[PDB]
């Protein structure tokens, strides 16, 4: 490095980038995948603390004859930061009598977004800034069976860990005691190792020169899958209002670490690994899709 003899002003550079962001807004695409009735819409509304799901939990739901993929778009503002958020859900996944090819529409959706981006990129008359419809996060909901993963879950996770970031969560964790939750987590982790399902955060995608990030992400992986509880209703406990669920024997607290693990999931999605998810999507998954497709479109 060349030593400096005064103040130059490179430190201001970050602020400049910040200012540019204020005029555009960051794009985030979440996709929830799981069987109907596991709390996907409620969890999306709990993470973003707004009615951002396509179907509100109150409205009636009918299982369609086919597996559909539905998307909804929103703009969320906080302290000058705009988030263009696209939440995509899978009505009819894992509910039919015959669930074969239930993961096909999901992968078709992800690959079609990649295709849109690559076609906008290759064109001669290209835009200055390419809109990003690529799925940045995929949250997979595991029913709280307490025994092991279902076969459909294993199949879909194996297919999906290859084209999109997947973060497993035990849906409706309020139904498991602490011992049961621990045993279920141990079984789920052993099964993930056995089937070699490498979920986000993949430590292979992190640089070796950085150790603090490696240890932090190792702790995050050691915590997975997350025992989550989602709810958009607040209740008075003690002398404070807490988001939670009310049953005759108590109230499950969403924001209490000793009750659930929603805190860790929301911290990773929003506060600690959002940009890492976007970077892995744009530098590991889209890059591999682009390589594979162009190695076929050589001519």
């Amino acid at each position: 490095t060349t030593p400096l003899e005064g103040y130059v002003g490179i430190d201001t550079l970050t602020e400049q980038i910040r200012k540019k962001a204020l005029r555009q807004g960051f794009e985030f695409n979440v996709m929830v995948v799981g069987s109907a009735g596991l709390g996907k819409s409620t969890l999306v509304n709990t993470i973003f603390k707004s009615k951002v799901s396509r179907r509100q939990p109150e409205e009636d739901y009918h299982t369609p004859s086919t597996v559909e993929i539905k998307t909804i778009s929103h703009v969320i503002e906080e302290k000058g930061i705009l988030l263009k958020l696209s939440v995509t859900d899978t009505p009819g996944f894992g509910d039919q009598v015959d669930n074969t090819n239930c993961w096909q529409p999901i992968m078709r959706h992800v690959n079609e977004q990649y295709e849109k981006y690559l076609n906008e990129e290759i064109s001669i008359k290209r835009r200055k800034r390419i809109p990003d419809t690529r799925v940045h996060c995929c949250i997979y909901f595991i029913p709280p069976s307490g025994h092991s993963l279902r076969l459909v879950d294993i199949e879909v996770m194996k297919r999906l860990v290859e084209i999109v970031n997947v973060i497993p969560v035990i849906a409706k964790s309020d139904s498991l005691t602490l011992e049961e939750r621990e045993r279920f987590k141990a079984t789920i982790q052993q099964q993930l190792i056995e089937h070699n399902i490498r979920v986000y955060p993949d430590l292979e995608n992190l640089d070796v020169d950085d150790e603090t990030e490696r240890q932090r992400n190792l702790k995050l992986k050691e915590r997975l899958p997350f025992a989550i509880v989602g709810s958009s209703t607040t209740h008075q406990v003690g002398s404070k209002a807490v988001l939670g669920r009310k049953a005759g024997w108590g109230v499950i607290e969403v924001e209490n670490d000793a009750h659930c693990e929603f805190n860790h999931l929301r911290n990773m999605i929003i506060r600690t690994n959002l940009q890492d998810l976007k970077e892995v999507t744009a530098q590991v998954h889209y890059e591999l899709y682009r390589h594979r497709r162009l190695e076929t479109l050589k001519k």
């Binding site: 069987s35 109907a36 009598v97 669930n99 279902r150 076969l151 309020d174 139904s175 024997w249 607290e253």
Partner: protein
């Protein structure tokens, strides 16, 4: 002694074994049918009880025609009784467990109850009621009943002896095997960091209603309807054909 046959149908991990242990207060514990015989000596009268579990139900990626095994089992018992006419091992009750989802009947449940409602008495139970709030439980019950009445499914209607208890169908059950000490009180229940969900509590789950109706109040009407309706109809075609 007394004879009874109870079949358990549902997806795995829905508290089926725990509920079966809880009702009968005993350590009783490819879709086929597995049979378990127990000899329960309680309340004076001795019951030789049969449990027909159907393991592997709903645990496959493709579940087409997975209800043919239970149909075959019921009809085989029917034929064995008909031949013996010239011990009542007929399956008298069938507990179906519906996942606590909160939306309505899945297509698999509709198909099972559409192709089994004229073979065996179907008692729908909402498995794991300790994961729903009361409002969700009522909404789910209403939606399930509406879809049952829409598809023309004939379930089992309990007879007159509890008026508000027999109208709780489908039942929402909670099962536990661990005895906890709540203020010096020996109670069966599940302990969460936020409280104790008690099995025998009438405001928590319908376990007491089901225990009373099935175990010791209406265990003979099930046999009577099985003999006079389902078995009679089954003979009404095989002999006719």
């Amino acid at each position: 002694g007394f004879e009874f046959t109870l079949m358990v149908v549902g997806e795995s991990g829905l508290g089926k074994s725990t509920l079966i242990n809880s009702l009968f207060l005993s350590d009783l514990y490819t879709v086929k049918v597995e049979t378990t015989k127990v000899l329960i000596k309680e309340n004076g009268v001795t019951l030789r009880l049969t449990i027909d579990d159907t393991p592997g139900f709903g645990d496959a990626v493709d579940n087409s025609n997975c209800w043919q095994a239970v149909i075959n089992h019921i009809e085989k018992k029917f034929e064995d009784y008909l031949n013996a006419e010239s011990a009542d091992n007929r399956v008298h009750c069938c507990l179906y467990f519906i996942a606590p989802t909160g939306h309505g009947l899945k297509p698999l449940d509709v198909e099972f109850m559409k192709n089994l409602h004229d073979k065996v008495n179907i008692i729908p139970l909402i498995a794991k009621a300790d994961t729903m709030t009361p409002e969700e439980c009522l909404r789910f019950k209403k939606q399930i009943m509406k879809e049952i009445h829409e598809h023309k499914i004939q379930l089992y209607e309990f007879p007159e002896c509890n008026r508000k208890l027999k109208s709780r169908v489908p039942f929402a059950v909670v099962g536990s095997n661990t005895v906890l000490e709540i203020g010096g009180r020996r109670v069966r229940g599940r302990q969460y960091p936020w409280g104790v969900a008690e099995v025998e509590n009438i405001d928590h789950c319908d376990f007491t209603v089901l225990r009373n109706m099935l175990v010791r109040t209406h265990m003979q009407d099930l046999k009577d309807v099985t003999n006079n309706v389902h078995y009679e109809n089954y003979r009404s075609k095989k002999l006719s054909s």
